[PDB]
Symmetry: D2
Amino acid sequence: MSDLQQHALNYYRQQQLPSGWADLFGVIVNGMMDNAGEREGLAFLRHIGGQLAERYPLPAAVTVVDLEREINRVLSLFHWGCVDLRPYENRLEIYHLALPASVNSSGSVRWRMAMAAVLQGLYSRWLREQGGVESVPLSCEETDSESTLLFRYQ
Amino acid sequence: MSDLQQHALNYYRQQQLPSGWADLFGVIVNGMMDNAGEREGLAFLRHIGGQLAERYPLPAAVTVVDLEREINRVLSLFHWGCVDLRPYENRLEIYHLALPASVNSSGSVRWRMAMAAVLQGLYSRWLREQGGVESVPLSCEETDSESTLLFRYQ
Amino acid sequence: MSDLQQHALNYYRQQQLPSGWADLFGVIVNGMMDNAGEREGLAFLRHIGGQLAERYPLPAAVTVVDLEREINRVLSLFHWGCVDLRPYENRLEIYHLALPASVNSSGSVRWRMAMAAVLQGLYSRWLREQGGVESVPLSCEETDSESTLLFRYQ
Amino acid sequence: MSDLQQHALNYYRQQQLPSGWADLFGVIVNGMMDNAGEREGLAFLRHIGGQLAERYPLPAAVTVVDLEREINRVLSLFHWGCVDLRPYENRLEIYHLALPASVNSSGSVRWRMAMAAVLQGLYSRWLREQGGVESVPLSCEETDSESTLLFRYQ
């Protein structure tokens, strides 16, 4: 690590979100969470994520590396970071890297929670349709770095 | 007119909205309008527009054309069309041109209404702060063309 | 027509070219045309267009509508306007619409000539590779509108 | 460091250059360097860099931090990395970070040399106009990291 690495990464993260639409989403989620509460907001955002997932159909793949390549292909259009797949004996581990940065210094955690909920719904629908098990959800998890999220599929 | 003009304008309007964020806003507004109703949805969207307007402060202008230039300067960053000012003896007409096109063939009117509400709130707050009258709202009006809106300030 | 149509089209054309790279290309072409002359500049730009065309391989199509769809798919990424195919008994007409606008008021014709040359080379290579005749070039032609070009394949 | 850092940085650098214009510049510089030689190509690239610098006038600053802020403001529009100023007793060091990545695996060094020349001309003109000394050029230097450059002003 060094100062130059910090400057480069900070500049890259700053150039990640486009003005106008992202701020509108931030205000919408802030207002809705202020109005209706936390649990209801999370459930609603998960439902919205599922509905958004329904619009984009992934082609039927056969191997996991096909899944990572296709998910990266779809996510590169939205500028929504990168994804890594790690298989295990009975688990699937989802690493999400380079999350869109927060837009307000006083509402970073709210934004992160909202984005995590939307992505959780998206991944849940995508994995359910491709041939997974419909009785198991995706568990969310924090990691030390701010710009990364962990997901577990059991 | 001609077919070439139609092709050019259609291609330009197609290249107007960025993928990902705009579709997310569309799903959010569709779900909220389906859930809470119409009047409450419009009121909430107007409030969101006001809050979004509060974030971007326009510099203090002195003439109407300066306001026109500043509003276009702010709107060119969002790709939210163009604006024209027409003053009168006691009225002010706001022409909004090249609105972001609809994303779904079955929800064009819903999208138009939502975008009109958000823009109405935005213009209301912007005009109120700069030195207008706080007891008069902005009246909305449709025009023959689908991509244009008329606003009246009395 | 109307004033509103002019405002909308002008704003759309203004939002067509990204800053930095396009201005760099403009300075490149102005300097090279000033240095080496006209005929050599056109020949060099045609060669560059062919070389650029070699990098992007269009999939093997079978009908003309497939060709226009593929060309539109490729050009939508560069923001290089739109293309229309018109077949005849022994001719093929290429209509190019919504050309990237000029960047300097004093060098509009130079920019248009350069862009026409590079597009002529690009289309020449694509049409030659897909199964056309290698002994016939693409003839350029000006049309009344400044933002449109005609190409003839005999 | 870790694998995740490499994935994030690689994805960010991949999303740095827009298609079409950048490839056109790459082909132009490759052809010109193949045709006219090395020294002449570098001289012409420096000249066009100065010409491009002439188009964008920096406001008259009074301190070095104003200069870094203004140069970053200008460069953020082109997506041309970031700049750091380090003053010394009689020297000035220009750190350029997050350079636009190479587009071809077989021409990375050619692209680096061309981009370095263009940036050298740009910085030379910019520093000359603002009140520097006209008899001293900017010396270029490479650093261990591929995506960073050092410039010396004596």
